[PDB]
Design a protein around this nucleic acid. Sequence first.
RNA 1: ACUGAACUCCUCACACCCAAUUGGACCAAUCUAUCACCCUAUAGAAGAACUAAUGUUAGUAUAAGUAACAUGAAAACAUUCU
Lengths: 166, 275, 148, 214, 130, 291, 108, 152
Amino acid sequence: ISRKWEKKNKIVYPPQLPGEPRRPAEIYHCRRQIKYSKDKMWYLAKLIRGMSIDQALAQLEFNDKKGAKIIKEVLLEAQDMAVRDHNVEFRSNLYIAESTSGRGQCLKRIRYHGRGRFGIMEKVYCHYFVKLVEGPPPPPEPPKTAVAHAKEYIQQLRSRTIVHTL
Amino acid sequence: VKKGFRAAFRFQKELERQRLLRCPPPPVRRSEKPNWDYHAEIQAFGHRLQENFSLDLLKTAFVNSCYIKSEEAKRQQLKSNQELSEQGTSFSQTCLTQFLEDEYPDMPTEGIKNLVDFLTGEEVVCHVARNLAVEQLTLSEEFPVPPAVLQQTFFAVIGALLQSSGPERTALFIRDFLITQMTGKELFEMWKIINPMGLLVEELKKRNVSAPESRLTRQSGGTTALPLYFVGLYCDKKLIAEGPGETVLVAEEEAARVALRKLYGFTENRRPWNY
Amino acid sequence: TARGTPSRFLASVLHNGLGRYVQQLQRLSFSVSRDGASSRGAREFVEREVIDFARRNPGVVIYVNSRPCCVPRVVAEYLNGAVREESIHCKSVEEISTLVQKLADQSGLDVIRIRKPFHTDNPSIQGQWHPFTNKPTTFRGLRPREVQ
Amino acid sequence: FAMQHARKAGLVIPPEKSDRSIHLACTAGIFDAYVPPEGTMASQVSIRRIKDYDANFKIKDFPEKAKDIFIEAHLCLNNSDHDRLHTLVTEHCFPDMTWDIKYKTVRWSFVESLEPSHVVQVRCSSMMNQGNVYGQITVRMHTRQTLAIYDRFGRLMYGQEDVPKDVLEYVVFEKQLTNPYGSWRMHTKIVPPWAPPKQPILKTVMIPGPQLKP
Amino acid sequence: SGTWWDEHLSEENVPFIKQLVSDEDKAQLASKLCPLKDEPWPIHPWEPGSFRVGLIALKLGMMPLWTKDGQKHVVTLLQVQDCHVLKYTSKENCNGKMATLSVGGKTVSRFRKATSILEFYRELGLPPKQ
Amino acid sequence: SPTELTEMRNDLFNKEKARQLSLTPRTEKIEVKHVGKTDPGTVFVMNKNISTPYSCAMHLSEWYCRKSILALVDGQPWDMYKPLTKSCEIKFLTFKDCDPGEVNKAYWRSCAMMMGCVIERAFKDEYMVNLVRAPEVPVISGAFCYDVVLDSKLDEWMPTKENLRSFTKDAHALIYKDLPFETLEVEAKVALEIFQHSKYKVDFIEEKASQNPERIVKLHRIGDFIDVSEGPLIPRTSICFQYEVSAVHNLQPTQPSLIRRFQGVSLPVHLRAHFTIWDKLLERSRKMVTE
Amino acid sequence: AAPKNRRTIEVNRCRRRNPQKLIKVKNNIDVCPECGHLKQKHVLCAYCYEKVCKETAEIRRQIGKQEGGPFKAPTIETVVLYTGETPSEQDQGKRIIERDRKRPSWFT
Amino acid sequence: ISHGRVFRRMGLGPESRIHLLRNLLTGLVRHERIEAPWARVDEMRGYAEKLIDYGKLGDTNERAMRMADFWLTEKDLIPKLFQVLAPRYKDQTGGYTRMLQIPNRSLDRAKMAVIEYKGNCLPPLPLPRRDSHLTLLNQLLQGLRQDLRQSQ
RNA sequence: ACUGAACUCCUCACACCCAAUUGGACCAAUCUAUCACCCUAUAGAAGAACUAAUGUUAGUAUAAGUAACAUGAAAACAUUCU
Ligand SMILES: [Mg+2]
Ligand SMILES: [Mg+2]
Ligand SMILES: [Mg+2]
Ligand SMILES: [Mg+2]
Ligand SMILES: [Mg+2]
Ligand SMILES: [Mg+2]
Ligand SMILES: [Mg+2]
Ligand SMILES: [Mg+2]
Ligand SMILES: [Mg+2]
Ligand SMILES: [Mg+2]
Ligand SMILES: [Mg+2]
Ligand SMILES: [Mg+2]
Ligand SMILES: [Mg+2]
Ligand SMILES: [Zn+2]
């Protein structure tokens, strides 16, 4: 097995100078051996990635699913964690950056089919990972406009050159 | 475990290689790295670029004033290179201006000196010196060394070379190396300009001719999003330059640039530098 | 493979051709040992040719470690700092001499595919071709089928 | 709930009886706290009782080593040298000193000492402590120091390294006399109420009220 | 976000919105009853090969029919509520085989419509259509 | 120059506020208690001159930060970016409450504020502007007004529809930048030195200084533009969704001092309007206000 | 029927990542003024609904012990009474039940 | 295909659908409140409406007596029906019940809805209240109402 | 007259394009003998090398998150109802 995700919180950056950019404090948290399929909550992870936490609390708790109850209790327990012993000023002015899922220690059993044949039934356990970062969330990159289309094509016609020649 | 340790040995070399690529350490001076002798390196370096003179003049050039501050600081807890760099950059400026104006009498003193300031700049001089291993011999406080400090050490070597060999050998050195970097870039790549047609009409009045007029000679794709115009500048119904461009304005200023090159004699088809 | 390997346009280090030529090999660092049967080629090479190699090339600097090593190595860095190590394990003195000679000959840039076998700094004389080089103009500057 | 859960779970065990006993190096708590003001015979007996266990013992020079141990023990917190701090600091004083500083560094410089550190009283243990005895000393300290704690990401939690500020503390030391290798080590602080509070934290906080159910 | 009109107003104001908007529709329809009092376009008589604009109606059911000979004929009903004209084109902005007009169906609520389509009806003068 | 005059005001406003938070001590603390039907019992340990109610709401939940427009400090409104200077009771309120009238009045002043900003910045640059104030009107007025006086050469001329549409798209651009209302408490001697030129702002400041016993007056800045307001204002510009000028009218003492006054209508994002109900509100605002 | 080639990961990845298989974010949430938490618009406040449900169960507990068994439902109205209240002249004829608590403000 | 069909399917036939519905409103009449799936109660509304509508006729109507005798098997609420619920709405004609959606059930995540007769005795639910009239939009709508009243 | 090859010529280097089958020049990893000592040399020995047997064992994908499975209803969760 591997448990590096807990060790990611143990790092300590050196002291920062007065005249330098304020760093956004990151923080990690996860839950282990949940009873839910890896690909199922990965949809939920695809929803929340790229928004605010309190706005994210609204979506999943109304989402009629079992995983949401499992990945909400990991969220606000990371919220009060980050403020109590990681020096986070606002419990709301932060944004999740990396939310993923992964397989866990599975368990194999037998399902009884007809005519004596057997089917190996795999029970699914998973590990859910979440990363938090302070500051407001970044805005979504809007679709590239016609000016971006035009300039990129003119840059292509300007960047090209003769080939197989002097 | 299956027997054998040869495979496990080379695997550790592969592990540390990946650990190097993942989290490489910061770079350091070659003096800090092993297999280094100071006196033998400047001597071997002097033979590389074909120069021979006293080590007292060499060491005084490579030594900076900043390292002396850290040297005496660590001593509590010798000779700078200001004079050598001063005479070095002084002779370089006069010598570069000499060969350039002898080859191009039409270039004015303003633009010809900006080119000399560019070749003697930081990005050009340090790039030549970085690719000549001057960074390994120079010693300072912080690493990577600043460009201004490395620039001072380069001209300091020119100063020590001037005092020992002479102007003719120092002339051959700065002439050969620096001009070869100038071969690539044309005039208005390093020497940017504003109002080229305004400067053109100013120069043409010095040369005693009339005010030219810009006229599109050929056209293509005008209404299309890819306009194309061949603008030519004529005076007394006689042409001097023709310049393409996106729009009429881009073709006009380009045609003004084309005349400025041939007026000062910096055409791409001019006589290369002899040796 | 060309596509799997990177590539480059041909170029020399700071235009070493026009001006005074400089041997672009900066340093050689030999790693030999007082023992190990594989080091017979390197040690005998150190005896005979490394002396004459230094007399032939005063510019290049040479270092020899002479420490315990199961395999001898030879490290070579150039003016640009490009380090290139090659294994001289179980090699004859004649091969090592030709190997060190070509190392002295080559420059400090990684051996990869070349996009083309030459490089021209001023390729254009008489003006490079544009579509309007080989066609005439029109009286009064008129496009086809245009009155004024 | 430990005994009740052991009953209901069924993890019955006998009492752990063994010839071995857990040997300590510091008594938990204190014997007598000096009630400070708003600003004796037992002391001399406790002083000379320490001399009966170690005749080569002085009082006039103790405040010197007390301040010497003070600045170097806190310099070890900056360097995070736990090995030296353990031999210089008791096992009751270690958690309260080194627990909350996890996930953060610390900076502590000593400017000077306005007033000299002065012994306040000396107290001593009885014989009924695992067949051992432990003495204690109290020392007032009035100096000026700087404090600046940076979190995991290197931003100051509070305090500035440049400005010092006056401070008053009543340090408590203790030593194991049964063995000879025992040495004086910081034990606890009296932290009286009448003393003023330290500087607040630049960051703002809240509290969650009583979570009222339906 | 996305919301609707009925959310953010009081219960006493909802009937005010209903009767006012309905009276606006009746006022717009009542004004456009007589186009002759306004300016009409030039009228021309029918010629061979010409055509006539159709219309839109509303089917409300079916019923039977009988003739003078007693023979039965099933027949539908098609009702026309408002059916106003909406646009005119030339056979040369359209560049088609023939010029085109536009015709509307029945009036519906002005609330469930698009802004670009709604302002088109405002300058037109009539209420929206199906 | 009118442009250099604007940066001159902004510089002095930076001089004034810099004196304020530099004068107040450092590491100050105050215990502000929360009051309201929602989440009572909480008390926040906040700063005296750098903390704000918007920061307090962000500790609690961003849902209030998006919904909070003002706050009640001991029974009187408060601007979301103005720092509370003592321990007190705090309660945030929104548009949908039992008595949101004070929030509307702040919006009435807010929408009345930057209407004066865009019109006097839009000016056709040689013309001058000698704006007077943003007159206070009740909620039943149906439109926010802003009085102004103008040169005499264009006295007979009134702005056309295309001139109105120009101001609307400009105002739509201002809100898109999400300008926050930076407020400040200043002295009458200070505020008169900012608006020493425009006489109509001079005597308006003496009027406020006369109404105030201590003569202290509050000030609100719209980016480069600055203006006085009687009551608090909304936190951000972006929360007003649709915003446009209705008409213009010009009041009988015209020749001694022309009284022009524009008129518009708008509403927040929390309750957006439909095209139809929005249209009947336009022709309501196009009419004249009696006052 | 049976497969014939292993579905690659890139085509498997594209199938499960298309927008319809993903859940659609909804801008249809607002704060409940009564409880302070969130609630869908067409749905009632879950907190206050649980408050009403559990209290009504306790009122159902009260009439149960009073009636004392099944098939004891009377044929008259009923009115709840809390501490600090007496029967009014209107509900004097209506059935009344005692209860030990304070009058909630949300309840009329 | 289905077009214009007002009824929907509940379970294992006509025998099943009304019988479980019958047990549902049978419990509604005694509690005057019930929580249940949305589609089930959506059908029960029309049944409860016609039930009390004919309950106004009184116990003298032998027809309605046999009907309520069938609808209710406990037999105790039928006297309660004619004597309590019918006088409760003898003046009120239509719209007897209020129906709002509630959150889903715990385990199966099925949509649920609550029913209750108006003027009930037990405490009400937190219904969705319309926004206050003191809002600016309501005041603007209140504004021109006087303008039109002043003009006309 | 042109286009046009691993044919031919040209600068340099050449043992470096046939199935089965035969002969040769080298060699990975391993143990031992002896050197060596950030991993190698000279010899011998062998359970001495796997892109393939509807191969064996184990792990994980594809089919697929598909086929398939489940709790009569109400509520005080006491009881009542189908
Ligand atoms: Mg299988
Ligand atoms: Mg069914
Ligand atoms: Mg050959
Ligand atoms: Mg064959
Ligand atoms: Mg080998
Ligand atoms: Mg084998
Ligand atoms: Mg294998
Ligand atoms: Mg098979
Ligand atoms: Mg097959
Ligand atoms: Mg196989
Ligand atoms: Mg399928
Ligand atoms: Mg099925
Ligand atoms: Mg079944
Ligand atoms: Zn609520």
